[PDB]
Design a protein around this nucleic acid. Structure first.
Ligand SMILES: [Mg+2]
Ligand SMILES: [Zn+2]
Ligand SMILES: [Zn+2]
Lengths: 79, 63, 49, 129, 141, 27, 188, 169, 33, 22
RNA sequence: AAACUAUGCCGACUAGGGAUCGGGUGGUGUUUUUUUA
C-alpha cells in the first residue's frame, strides 16, 4: 500500500520519470576538464553530440543510447 | 395493511413508483405498509448493489 | 468443542439507523448504556440490556 | 473517441468507489471538476480532496468514504427552467428526495435544491446520488 | 497512441517543475542570443540549435534562460524558415521515398509507406493553412 | 534477498520501525 | 443533550437539548476529559472547551494541518492524542496547555485508543491494513504491529482488562488481537 | 555617493535614507563589488511586521535591476542584516494577477526555490494553500518561514503555508 | 460458471448511458419540458 | 555542425538560391 | 482445389505472479583484458 498524496522519497526514486507525482528530469549536468588545457566545460549527462573542448577541439564525450560516455582521462563533477 | 415483499421494492424503484403514494393511488385509501424482519434481512443480504433499495425500505412511513 | 460452540453474534440494537453509523460512544460508568450517531444527523441512546 | 475531462474524472471516481479503493487520482483537473467535487463534499459523498500543481493541467487526490452510489455528467447541456427542475429530478434520480442534480447557473455550479432556493437556473452538468 | 501505427510508447522529455534559470548558470542572456543567431546563420534548424546549446553550453532551455523561445529569438533577428520545421522534414522524407520508388518499382512496401507520409503532410499542411502560417494557396508538390 | 547477495550496503530495518517517516524531537 | 434513564427508582424531566456551542469551522472529532468537565474537539483546529463556557477556552494546534480524530488518555487524564490529515500523530498535555510530540507515518491513522491498564501505551488504527502499538515516551519504535486485515483499519479499542484489542476494517470484518501477539486470534 | 542617489523616489523616507547609507557604505568598503553595487538602485522599501514581533524589509526594486540584485542579492542581504538586525531583508520587484503573485512568491523564496504547490479542500469548505520549498538552506529558511507567510499575506492578501518537505517540523 | 452475473437494480430511464456521459435526446427534452 | 547544416531552410537561404538560379 | 471437431462470457474494468524480446538506469564480481582501433 502507498499513499498517493505523500509518497515516500525512496518509492518516488524507483518510479518512471513521467509517473511520479510531479514529473521531472532524471538527467543532470557535469563540469568536465579537458585533459589537454585543463579548462572546464559544461556537459549534459545524456548529451547527443560529441562535445569538444573549444580551446583544444578535443573530444570530451561520445553519444550513446542513454548517458553519454565520457572520454578517458576527462575528470568530471556534478554541477 | 399491506405486507411488502422484497422484489416489490426493487420493481417499484425500477418504475419510479413511490411506495406510500403508489399504494394510495392504486386503492384510493390510506395504506399502512409493513416490512417484516425477513424482508429487511433479505434486502441486507442482497449486498452493496441494492443499497438504494435498503434506504427506501427504511423510510419512516414504512412501519 | 470450542469450534462447535463458537456462536459470537448475539443480536442487533433495535432497528438500527436510517443511514450508516459513523460514531459510537460508550458510557464508561454504566455497563449497559451506549450512544450512537449516523450520517442522517440522528443520535440515539440505547439500553443494550 | 476520447471523453471530456469531467466524464473521465467521474468515471474514475465511480470505478475507485466500486472496486473498494479509498483514494483515487484524477488527472487532468479543472475548475469545473473542483466545483463538482465541492458540491459532492458539501453533501458528504466524498471526503477531503487535495489539488497538486505540476505546472500542467494539474492533479487531484480524492478520498472516498464509501457513501457514493453513482455520479455522472449529462449531455447535451440543455437549459432547465426553475419550474421544470422538480420534473427533471423525477426523471434523473432514483427517488423523490434521493440524490442531487447539479446545474451550472448564473451564480455558479450548485445542486438543484440550492438553485431553487436562489431562484436561479441554467444548464445541467450532471448528477450525484 | 501513434497515428498510422500500433505502438503505444510514452518516451518523452520531462520539463522540470521550476521555470527559473539554474543557479549554477552564470552566462549572460545576450551571449546565448548571439550563439543562437550564429548557428542559424550556419544553417542549423531550431531543433538542432537547442541540442548544441543544451549539450555543450549548459543552456537547459532557451525559454528559461533567455525568456523567449528559439523560434521567436530567430524571428526577432530576421531568421525565419520558409515552412514549419516538422513540415520541412515530412516533405524531404516524401521526396526520398519517391526517388527510391523511381528506381525500384516493385517495392510495394515503399508505396504503402509513401501513402502514410503524404497523409501526414496533408493533415499537417491543413493545420498551418488554417492558422495562416502557410499561405492559403500552398499545395504539396 | 537477491539484492543482498551483491549489495554491499543494504541495511536491515525492523518491521516495527518501517512505518515511521520521521519525528520532530530526536532522542 | 440530556437523556432520562431508569437506572434508579429514588425519584417520583428536561429531556432534550441543554446547550449549544457554535464554532467558526466544521468539527471532526470530540472527546471528553474523564476527571473534569473540559472536552476537546478536533476540526480544522483542535480546541479545548469547557462546559460552562460557550467559546473554546484554549486553542491547541501544531500547525495549519487539520485534525481528524482525538482521544483522551484514561489514567493520566491530562494527556491527549490526535491524528492529522498529514499522516501525523500529535501528543498534548493539558498541564502545559501545549502539544508535546509529533511523528509522521507513511499513511493516515484513523483512530487512537489508550491502554486502560498502562498509562503510557496506545494503539493506532492505520490505513496500510495495520494497527500499531506505541509507547508514549519512545515513539521512534513501535511496540507491536497487527497485520491480519486486508483493507484500511478504521477503528480500534482496548478491552478494559488491557490484554486485547479489537479492530474494525473497511474489508467488512472485525478482528481481535492479543496485545502480546502480532496476529489476530479471531475474525467476525 | 549620496544615499539619495540610490533612492529613485524623489521624496525619500528616513528608513530609505538609512538603508541607502548602508548600501553606499558597502560600496565604499567594497574594493571591486562596488562595480556592481553602484549601478543597482531601488525604488522604495516597506517595513512590515511579522507574527513573531519582528519586521521584514521589503525592498521594492525595478525588474531589470532586480536581475542584477539577484546576481549580488546574497552578499547585500547578509550585510544589510548585519547593519540592520531585527530586520529580515528581501528584494522584491514592482510589477495577470496570478502571474504577478507567482513572481512575487518567487522573489520572496529567493535564493531558495519552490518544489511544489498544493491546495487541500477540507470537508467544511475551508481551503489550506501550501507551498513546498527545497532543502538547499533548510536551517536559514526554517528561521524565516513565518516571515515569508506574513510578507505574502501583507502584499498579496492571501493565506499561504510554507512547508519544507523532507524535514519534519 | 454458467450463472449470469447479477446486474443490480435499474435506477434511471431518461437517457442512454455511455462512456462520455448520459445522453438525453432532443425529443425527450421537449417531452419532459 | 557542418553535416547537420541545411542548405535550404531559412528565408535568406532560398533567396540566395533564387539569386543564383537566375 | 479449399474446408472436415472446433469454443473462448463481454467491457469503459482492479491488483498481481513466473517466464521471455528490445531499450534505458544503478549495483556487484566472474568471464573479458594491456596506450593499435
Ligand atoms: Mg515517432
Ligand atoms: Zn582543452
Ligand atoms: Zn418473518
Amino acid at each position: 500500500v502507498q499513499d498517493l498524496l505523500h509518497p515516500t522519497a525512496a518509492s518516488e526514486a524507483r518510479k518512471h520519470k513521467l509517473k511520479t507525482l510531479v514529473q521531472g528530469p532524471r538527467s543532470y549536468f557535469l563540469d568536465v576538464k579537458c585533459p589537454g588545457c585543463l579548462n572546464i566545460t559544461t556537459v549534459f549527462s545524456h548529451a547527443q553530440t560529441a562535445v569538444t573542448c573549444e580551446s583544444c577541439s578535443t573530444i570530451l564525450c561520445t553519444p550513446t543510447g542513454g548517458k553519454a560516455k565520457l572520454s578517458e582521462g576527462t575528470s568530471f563533477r556534478r554541477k | 395493511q399491506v405486507l411488502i415483499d422484497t422484489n416489490f421494492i426493487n420493481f417499484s424503484i425500477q418504475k419510479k413508483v413511490d411506495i406510500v403514494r403508489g399504494m394510495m393511488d392504486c386503492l384510493l385509501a390510506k395504506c399502512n405498509p409493513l416490512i417484516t424482519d425477513c424482508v429487511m434481512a433479505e434486502l441486507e443480504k442482497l449486498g452493496p448493489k441494492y443499497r438504494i433499495a435498503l434506504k427506501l425500505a427504511r423510510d419512516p412511513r414504512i412501519k | 468443542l470450542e469450534r462447535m460452540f463458537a456462536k459470537p453474534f448475539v443480536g442487533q440494537l433495535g432497528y438500527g439507523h436510517r443511514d450508516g453509523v459513523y460514531a459510537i460512544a460508550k458510557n464508561y460508568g454504566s455497563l449497559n448504556k451506549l450512544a450512537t450517531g449516523s450520517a442522517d444527523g440522528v443520535i440515539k441512546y440505547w439500553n443494550m440490556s | 473517441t476520447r471523453s471530456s475531462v469531467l466524464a473521465d474524472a467521474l468515471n474514475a471516481i465511480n470505478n475507485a468507489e466500486k472496486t473498494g479503493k479509498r483514494q483515487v487520482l484524477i488527472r487532468p483537473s479543472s475548475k469545473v471538476i473542483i466545483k463538482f467535487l465541492q458540491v459532492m463534499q458539501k453533501h458528504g459523498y466524498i471526503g477531503e480532496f487535495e489539488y497538486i500543481d505540476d505546472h500542467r493541467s494539474g492533479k487531484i487526490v480524492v478520498q472516498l468514504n464509501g457513501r457514493l452510489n453513482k455520479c455522472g455528467v449529462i449531455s447535451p447541456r440543455f437549459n432547465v427552467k426553475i419550474g421544470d427542475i422538480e420534473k427533471w429530478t423525477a426523471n434523473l434520480l432514483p427517488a423523490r428526495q434521493f440524490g442531487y442534480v447539479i446545474l451550472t447557473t448564473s451564480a455558479g455550479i450548485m445542486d438543484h435544491e440550492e438553485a431553487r432556493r436562489k431562484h436561479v437556473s441554467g444548464k445541467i452538468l450532471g448528477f450525484v446520488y | 497512441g501513434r497515428m498510422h501505427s500500433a505502438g503505444k510508447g510514452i518516451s518523452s522529455s520531462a520539463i522540470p517543475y521550476s521555470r527559473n534559470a539554474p543557479a549554477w548558470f552564470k552566462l549572460s542572456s545576450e551571449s546565448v542570443i548571439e550563439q543562437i543567431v550564429k548557428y542559424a546563420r550556419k544553417g542549423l534548424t531550431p531543433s538542432q540549435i537547442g541540442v548544441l546549446l543544451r549539450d555543450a553550453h549548459g543552456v537547459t532551455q532557451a525559454r528559461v534562460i533567455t525568456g523567449n523561445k528559439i523560434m521567436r529569438i530567430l524571428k526577432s533577428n530576421g531568421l525565419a524558415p520558409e515552412i514549419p520545421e516538422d513540415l520541412y522534414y515530412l516533405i524531404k522524407k516524401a521526396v526520398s521515398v519517391r526517388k527510391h520508388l523511381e528506381r525500384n518499382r516493385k517495392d510495394k512496401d515503399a508505396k504503402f509507406r509513401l501513402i502514410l507520409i503524404e497523409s501526414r503532410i496533408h493533415r499537417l499542411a491543413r493545420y498551418y493553412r488554417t492558422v495562416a502560417v502557410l499561405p492559403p494557396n500552398w499545395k504539396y508538390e | 534477498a537477491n539484492e543482498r547477495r551483491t549489495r554491499k550496503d543494504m541495511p536491515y530495518i525492523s518491521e516495527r520501525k518501517k512505518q515511521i517517516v520521521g519525528t520532530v524531537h530526536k532522542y | 443533550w440530556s437523556i432520562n434513564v431508569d437506572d434508579y427508582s429514588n425519584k417520583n424531566n428536561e429531556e432534550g437539548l441543554i446547550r449549544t456551542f457554535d464554532g467558526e469551522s466544521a468539527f471532526q472529532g470530540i472527546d471528553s476529559h474523564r476527571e473534569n468537565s473540559t472536552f476537546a474537539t478536533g476540526g480544522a483546529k483542535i480546541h479545548l472547551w469547557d462546559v460552562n463556557r460557550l467559546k473554546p477556552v484554549s486553542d491547541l494546534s501544531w500547525g495549519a494541518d487539520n485534525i481528524t480524530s482525538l482521544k483522551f488518555n484514561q489514567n493520566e487524564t491530562d494527556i491527549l492524542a490526535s491524528t492529522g490529515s498529514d499522516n501525523s500523530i500529535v501528543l498534548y498535555d493539558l498541564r502545559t496547555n501545549s502539544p508535546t510530540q509529533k511523528i509522521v507515518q507513511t499513511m493516515r491513522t484513523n483512530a487512537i485508543c489508550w491502554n486502560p491498564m498502562e498509562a503510557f501505551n496506545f494503539v493506532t488504527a492505520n490505513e496500510d491494513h495495520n494497527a500499531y502499538y506505541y509507547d508514549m515516551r519512545n515513539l521512534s519504535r513501535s511496540l507491536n504491529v497487527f497485520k491480519d486485515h486486508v483493507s484500511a483499519v478504521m477503528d480500534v479499542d482496548f478491552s478494559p482488562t488491557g490484554d486485547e484489542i479489537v479492530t474494525g476494517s473497511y474489508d467488512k470484518s472485525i478482528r481481535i488481537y492479543k496485545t502480546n501477539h502480532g496476529h489476530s486470534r479471531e475474525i467476525y | 555617493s549620496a544615499p539619495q542617489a540610490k533612492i529613485l523616489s524623489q521624496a525619500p523616507t528616513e528608513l530609505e535614507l538609512q538603508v541607502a547609507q548602508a548600501f553606499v557604505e558597502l560600496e565604499n568598503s567594497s574594493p571591486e563589488l562596488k562595480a556592481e553595487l553602484r549601478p543597482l538602485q531601488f525604488k522604495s522599501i516597506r517595513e512590515i511586521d511579522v507574527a513573531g514581533g519582528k519586521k521584514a524589509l521589503a525592498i521594492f526594486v525595478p525588474v531589470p535591476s532586480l536581475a542584477g540584485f539577484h546576481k549580488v542579492q546574497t552578499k547585500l542581504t547578509r550585510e544589510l542584516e548585519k547593519k540592520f538586525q531585527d530586520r529580515h531583508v528581501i528584494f522584491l520587484a514592482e510589477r495577470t494577477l496570478t502571474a504577478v503573485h507567482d513572481k512575487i512568491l518567487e522573489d520572496l523564496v529567493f535564493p531558495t526555490e519552490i518544489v511544489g504547490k498544493r491546495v487541500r479542500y477540507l470537508v467544511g469548505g475551508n481551503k489550506i494553500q501550501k507551498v513546498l520549498l527545497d532543502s538547499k538552506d533548510v536551517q536559514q529558511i526554517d528561521y524565516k518561514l513565518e516571515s515569508f507567510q506574513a510578507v505574502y499575506n501583507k502584499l498579496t492578501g492571501k493565506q499561504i503555508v510554507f512547508e519544507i518537505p523532507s524535514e519534519t517540523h | 460458471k454458467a450463472t449470469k452475473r447479477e446486474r443490480g437494480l435499474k435506477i434511471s430511464s431518461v437517457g442512454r448511458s455511455t462512456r462520455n456521459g448520459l445522453i438525453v435526446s432532443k425529443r425527450d427534452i421537449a417531452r419532459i419540458s | 555542425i557542418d553535416k547537420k547544416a541545411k542548405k535550404d531552410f531559412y528565408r535568406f537561404q532560398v533567396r540566395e538560391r533564387k539569386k543564383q538560379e537566375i
